[PDB]
Amino acid sequence: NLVAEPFAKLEQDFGGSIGVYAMDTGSGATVSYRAEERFPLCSSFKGFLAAAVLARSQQQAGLLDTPIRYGKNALVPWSPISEKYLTTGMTVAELSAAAVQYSDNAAANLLLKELGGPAGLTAFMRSIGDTTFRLDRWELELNSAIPGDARDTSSPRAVTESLQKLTLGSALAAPQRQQFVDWLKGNTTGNHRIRAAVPADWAVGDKTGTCGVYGTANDYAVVWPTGRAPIVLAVYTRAPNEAVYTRAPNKDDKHSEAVIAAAARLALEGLG
Asked: Which cysteine pairs are joined by S-S bonds (predicted)?
């Protein structure tokens, strides 16, 4: 009750719902708030998509350097890397880096197609023991974040547990885990979320998600303190339950950025 109060207060100030799960891999200590509830994945599925690619790389030689020669019909809004390389194509690894580090939408759809679609990615998550994750749609429709809709959702606890398995655990061999870690570490889209909570001399790898509803957003991360075991955590939000066309949205709350950072701080502080 007392441990949760700061999260409850943060949630009450936010007006929507917040979900947090954090685990310290050295002590086993955890912090949990609405950790079993479902939240829209949004773009955060792209990290698990890259992990699924890496799982296939344990069995198919040359997959990562295989070129995908896509056309303009594969492009989607906010596909800055795919657009830049439209005239040369991109390899599977380059598409994975683009999906993870720039949240490139076309790259995500191209990789989804290679892995059997949303059902294929979901089957991969089942294969690592994640019974909560479900992906049902493609970009951009998977971002709809319709309240009560279980499509394209998971829970903070399942996200954290799967992330730990794929970066630090046994769901992938070390060369694959290292590539996943390096992609996450180089993410460019998370500088206002979990990373805002982390001491500078630590390291972070993360993947953000931002849905088609203001206030529904998320981030998950592995955090490496100096001289201490890594921490794995996930912070998800659902927007409060008119639209303004004459101004750009607030940078601190449009994607729950301040709330996600604040929740991440409380999680790191609460571990013990």
From this structure: 42-211
